Amino acid sequence: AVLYQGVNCTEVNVFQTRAGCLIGAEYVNNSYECDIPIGAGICASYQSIIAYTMSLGAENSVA
Amino acid sequence: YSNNSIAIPTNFTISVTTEILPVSMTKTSVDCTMYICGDSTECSNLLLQYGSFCTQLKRALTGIAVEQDKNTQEVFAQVKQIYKTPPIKYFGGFNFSQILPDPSKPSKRSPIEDLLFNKVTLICAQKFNGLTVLPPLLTDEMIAQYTSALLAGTITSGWTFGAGPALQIPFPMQMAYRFNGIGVTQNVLYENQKLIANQFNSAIGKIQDSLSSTPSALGKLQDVVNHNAQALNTLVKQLSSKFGAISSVLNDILSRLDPPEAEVQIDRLITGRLQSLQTYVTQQLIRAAEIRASANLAATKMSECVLGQSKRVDFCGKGYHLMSFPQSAPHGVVFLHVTYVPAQEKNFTTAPAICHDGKAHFPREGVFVSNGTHWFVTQRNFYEPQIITTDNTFVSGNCDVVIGIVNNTVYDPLQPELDS
Amino acid sequence: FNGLTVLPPLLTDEMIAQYTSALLAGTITSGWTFGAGPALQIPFPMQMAYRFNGIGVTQNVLYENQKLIANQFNSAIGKIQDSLSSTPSALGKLQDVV
Amino acid sequence: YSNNSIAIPTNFTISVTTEILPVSMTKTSVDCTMYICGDSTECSNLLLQYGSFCTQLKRALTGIAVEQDKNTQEVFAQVKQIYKTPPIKYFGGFNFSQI
Amino acid sequence: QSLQTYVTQQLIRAAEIRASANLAATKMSECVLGQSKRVDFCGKGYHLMS
Ligand SMILES: *[C@@H]1O[C@H](CO)[C@@H](O[C@@H]2O[C@H](CO)[C@@H](O)[C@H](O)[C@H]2NC(C)=O)[C@H](O)[C@H]1NC(C)=O
Ligand SMILES: *[C@@H]1O[C@H](CO)[C@@H](O[C@@H]2O[C@H](CO)[C@@H](O)[C@H](O)[C@H]2NC(C)=O)[C@H](O)[C@H]1NC(C)=O
Ligand SMILES: *[C@@H]1O[C@H](CO)[C@@H](O[C@@H]2O[C@H](CO)[C@@H](O)[C@H](O)[C@H]2NC(C)=O)[C@H](O)[C@H]1NC(C)=O
Ligand SMILES: *[C@@H]1O[C@H](CO)[C@@H](O[C@@H]2O[C@H](CO)[C@@H](O)[C@H](O)[C@H]2NC(C)=O)[C@H](O)[C@H]1NC(C)=O
Ligand SMILES: *[C@@H]1O[C@H](CO)[C@@H](O[C@@H]2O[C@H](CO)[C@@H](O)[C@H](O)[C@H]2NC(C)=O)[C@H](O)[C@H]1NC(C)=O
Ligand SMILES: *[C@@H]1O[C@H](CO)[C@@H](O[C@@H]2O[C@H](CO)[C@@H](O)[C@H](O)[C@H]2NC(C)=O)[C@H](O)[C@H]1NC(C)=O
Ligand SMILES: *[C@@H]1O[C@H](CO)[C@@H](O[C@@H]2O[C@H](CO)[C@@H](O)[C@H](O)[C@H]2NC(C)=O)[C@H](O)[C@H]1NC(C)=O
Ligand SMILES: *[C@@H]1O[C@H](CO)[C@@H](O)[C@H](O)[C@H]1NC(C)=O
Ligand SMILES: *[C@@H]1O[C@H](CO)[C@@H](O)[C@H](O)[C@H]1NC(C)=O
């Protein structure tokens, strides 16, 4: 996948992130651990190549 | 100073102080060819002669960029489970609204965090010449979430969540544990709970007001921002220097002269800009090393003062440490240290041991004091007179070895029991 | 000669010595209390007993052997000056800086 | 090392040791033009073409100079009360004349 | 170039001295203003004072 840094996606599977324009990866609403950091909370991984928002950790409500 | 006199406190004060620590600087990246030469191709061919300088600069900047993210992750991401505070915000009178997240704000930040965010504060020119800034891996919302998780964990479970599974504990009992930590018995807190809670709330309010009313409190983070911006501005401004050539713009030299002398002019420009880039890289490396040291200190402080109670003097605030709270700030962290300070001391007359029936009695955990006619045993950090019995004193030897022994009677708690 | 100057320090040696003397007086007269709040006086043998308890030894050990401990401390304080004076490499770091 | 045996100390020794730590170095300042060119005007005119190198050097040296004072203040200035020893220098047999 | 070399050397030595000064400040805070339980931080043996 190719990331054009600091470029709006209209000046070049197309995704628009705060870091830049991402080509070749599909955005997924699911959250996982960060595998390949991209930036601005966005990480990419191979499962095709997917891009997602990293999960801080497992939720736990202490009683 | 004297040699049979002691001073014992009779009251206390809960004090909250602030500590600001930078963590990470701005991640930056450079383009050697575009900065040095630009759109010209002859300049690139001439620059290719100098070797692998641009590769070295790019590698160093990449190393610094990844180190910044490593620093932030080390400082904040210390708990892999995020905790949530219970819906009913009652903790036995302690009132944490000024540090808990505010649902009303869209950013979900505490009022103190919001104040810190607001109190810390040409780009196209830097961007257009081959200099770029990279966004941080962790957004501000994630940092706030991490801090909220840490604070909820330290509120609901004490220090137990830092060394294993989180075990719940009522907040007054946790305060009693932390009071026992510094040598004060639990009954003091269990009898002055209301006063302690009122003092804590007043201290928190004063912290917010003091942070709001002083502009120089956050000098370190502002210094970091100013240093980065000024270094970038100087690097940009270096492009306008002639450096011994005839013109500071490459296009005019290319379109005005013949190649045999244009090569000399571009040689001068190339060497000048290479020197500027090397100087910038070296300064960035040194500043990155200093910031890494600060980040390691911040991580140690978070591990020791927040996730537990520290016995080290002045490490987690002035006075006897009680606990701490973390808050996020642009490019750094702010610690609120809650500590215990004695006050309202009083004179007393003291002796090292008590002689009774030819036996010397020494205190178990306290100290012998005298109000002028009678002798008592008290704690060292709080005045609480008690009758001298065999429970709080132990016997060792006779009365002649020690210096300064004082006659007195030692009550026997079993004496009325067997007598009756 | 050539445009280089050395600037005087903000703290003169006398005021640094004054700071050290203040610290010594505080730690002698009030133990560790003065560092965590108001200074509370305490007889020195009692402070020694407190510091002996701090390491896991009861107070009677200090109280019954006060003269011996005082003599040992005085002997060590006497020895340290000769140790510093008789060895030229003891002060290597500061001289290295200079 | 044994099976059911220990060694218990029976007597003690008070030990005093030294530790030397540098705190601050010498604050120094430089003049870029005077050092590089002296009183020559042509050399200064040529030096003006290089830009803002001298400003960077001055800024770095000033930062070091202020950092030295910050180091000394952090190390020593830790009490805001100037305590005084009592006139009678008796502390139960302990002798502090050497310090 | 001579001046730049001198300045860079001064910067590195200043960083070293700053680290040493921070260590000295920590030692003064912990060993002098109180009793330290850390091993070999304030001298060989069981710490009494400084
Ligand atoms: C101790 O008892 C409490 C009940 O008050 C338990 O809390 C509940 O635990 C279950 C099991 O995971 C959760 O589904 C509930 O949501 C919890 N209640 C609340 C209000 O959070 C707690 O798990 C028990 N702890 C142990 C170790 O048994
Ligand atoms: C210990 O100090 C607290 C406050 O520092 C004292 O409580 C104050 O008492 C006065 C008179 O009763 C009130 O006007 C104040 O409002 C109280 N302060 C607070 C914060 O509630 C307390 O009396 C002191 N205890 C002793 C034994 O002197
Ligand atoms: C906890 O602290 C907050 C903030 O000091 C208190 O909120 C104040 O409540 C009064 C009365 O309801 C309002 O007039 C103020 O405007 C509130 N302050 C803010 C900043 O909103 C709160 O009452 C305290 N206790 C509880 C239980 O929330
Ligand atoms: C020193 O403290 C003791 C203990 O409280 C005082 O003894 C009591 O004093 C009160 C009033 O002075 C009397 O009502 C009690 O009957 C006394 N108790 C006993 C067992 O005698 C003593 O008076 C205090 N001394 C001074 C000078 O204040
Ligand atoms: C503490 O009490 C002891 C025992 O009552 C005192 O020792 C006696 O002192 C008198 C007068 O000096 C002598 O005549 C006795 O021979 C002593 N008896 C013993 C067993 O030594 C001692 O003097 C008292 N100390 C103070 C300071 O009053
Ligand atoms: C513990 O060690 C000290 C010295 O480190 C011993 O003190 C010496 O004792 C001998 C025998 O009485 C004397 O001749 C010396 O003059 C003493 N030295 C000092 C400095 O006072 C002490 O005796 C030892 N403890 C025991 C129980 O033997
Ligand atoms: C404390 O130590 C000092 C110095 O170690 C002692 O002063 C010495 O006293 C003797 C006898 O009067 C002289 O011969 C020495 O010249 C003195 N030394 C110095 C450096 O002046 C002192 O006696 C010791 N004790 C007290 C109580 O001060
Ligand atoms: C205690 O102090 C007084 C005066 O401060 C002094 O005269 C006396 O000798 C001291 N005690 C001892 C045992 O020396
Ligand atoms: C004592 O040592 C022997 C072998 O050296 C070992 O078998 C035995 O278990 C030890 N004693 C105890 C109580 O374990």
Swiss-Prot record, chain D:
<feature type="glycosylation site" description="N-linked (GlcNAc...) (hybrid) asparagine; by host">
    <location>
        <position position="95"/>
    </location>
</feature>
<feature type="glycosylation site" description="N-linked (GlcNAc...) (high mannose) asparagine; by host">
    <location>
        <position position="3"/>
    </location>
</feature>
<comment type="function">
    <text>Precursor of the fusion protein processed in the biosynthesis of the S protein and the formation of virus particle. Mediates fusion of the virion and cellular membranes by functioning as a class I viral fusion protein. Contains two viral fusion peptides that are unmasked after cleavage. The S2/S2' cleavage occurs during virus entry at the cell membrane by host TMPRSS2 or during endocytosis by host CSTL.</text>
</comment>
<protein>
    <recommendedName>
        <fullName>Spike protein S2</fullName>
    </recommendedName>
</protein>
<feature type="glycosylation site" description="N-linked (GlcNAc...) (hybrid) asparagine; by host">
    <location>
        <position position="11"/>
    </location>
</feature>
<feature type="disulfide bond">
    <location>
        <begin position="37"/>
        <end position="43"/>
    </location>
</feature>
<feature type="disulfide bond">
    <location>
        <begin position="32"/>
        <end position="54"/>
    </location>
</feature>
